[PDB]
Design a protein around this ligand. Structure first.
Ligand SMILES: Nc1ncnc2c1ncn2[C@@H]1O[C@H](COP(=O)(O)O)[C@@H](O)[C@H]1O
Ligand SMILES: Nc1ncnc2c1ncn2[C@@H]1O[C@H](COP(=O)(O)O)[C@@H](O)[C@H]1O
Ligand SMILES: [Cl-]
Ligand SMILES: [Cl-]
Ligand SMILES: [Cl-]
Ligand SMILES: [Cl-]
Ligand SMILES: [Cl-]
Ligand SMILES: [Cl-]
Ligand SMILES: [Cl-]
Ligand SMILES: [K+]
Ligand SMILES: [K+]
Ligand SMILES: [K+]
Ligand SMILES: [K+]
Ligand code: NA
Length: 177
């Protein structure tokens, strides 16, 4: 299924390319032909056309293809440089997290923790669902993106809904949901 193959694509492109003999470039790109070869080690019926269809149909915009190169746009667990188009349109964004982080966030802002980018979403439901990944005490922070930009932070379009930024200062958090 698309769900099973996309799950393997995401694992290879974000977390363990070397396991499949792929070496991502500094921006996380690998040869799409080599990704087909890697994926067919699990799912031999997969084709390059299929992988391209998965990219086109992915509801989050998880994947990006440029020429012969394919990458995950966000979510890597290894170091990657992500030079995505700037989001200049959003005025409000959302950050889903858990209540236990509020004390630290309220003093320090939203900080990069292991990855070098803070993850935001244009969609409140998406942020809520993403916060649920860290537990049941979910809170969603409303972020004044215009304020973020005015402070000189560039917000990049990493998916259809995901947005990335270096840091969210406390005074850009307008509310807690
Ligand atoms: N079910 C999940 N629970 C927790 N973290 C996840 C889950 N799925 C993916 N992740 C992590 O969150 C990132 C984004 O997932 P997604 O936005 O669904 O592509 C992944 O690259 C992983 O780092
Ligand atoms: N200052 C902070 N104190 C505590 N937790 C934070 C802080 N800044 C960010 N976080 C959390 O760190 C986590 C990073 O998740 P991810 O960006 O998916 O790796 C999210 O749950 C954030 O809400
Ligand atoms: Cl690996
Ligand atoms: Cl693309
Ligand atoms: Cl990321
Ligand atoms: Cl990049
Ligand atoms: Cl680039
Ligand atoms: Cl979020
Ligand atoms: Cl997550
Ligand atoms: K995609
Ligand atoms: K990648
Ligand atoms: K506090
Ligand atoms: K984050
Ligand atoms: Na997370």
């Amino acid at each position: 299924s698309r769900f099973k193959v996309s799950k393997l694509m995401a694992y290879i492109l974000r977390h363990s390319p070397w396991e499949f003999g792929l070496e991502p470039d500094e921006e996380g790109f690998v040869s799409i032909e080599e990704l087909v070869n890697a994926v067919r080690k699990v799912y031999p019926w997969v084709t390059e056309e299929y992988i391209r269809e998965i990219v086109e149909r992915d509801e989050k915009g998880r994947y990006e293809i440029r020429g012969n190169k394919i990458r995950a746009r966000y979510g890597h667990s290894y170091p990657v440089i992500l030079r995505h188009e700037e989001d200049k349109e959003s005025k409000v964004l959302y950050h889903g997290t858990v209540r236990r982080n509020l004390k630290g966030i309220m003093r320090e802002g939203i900080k990069p923790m292991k990855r070098q980018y803070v993850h935001l979403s244009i969609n409140y439901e998406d942020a809520y669902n993403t916060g649920m990944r860290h537990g049941e005490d979910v809170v969603v922070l409303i972020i004044d993106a215009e304020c973020l930009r005015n402070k000189g932070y560039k917000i990049l379009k990493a998916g259809k809904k995901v947005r990335i930024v270096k840091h969210v200062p406390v005074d850009c958090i307008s509310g807690i949901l």
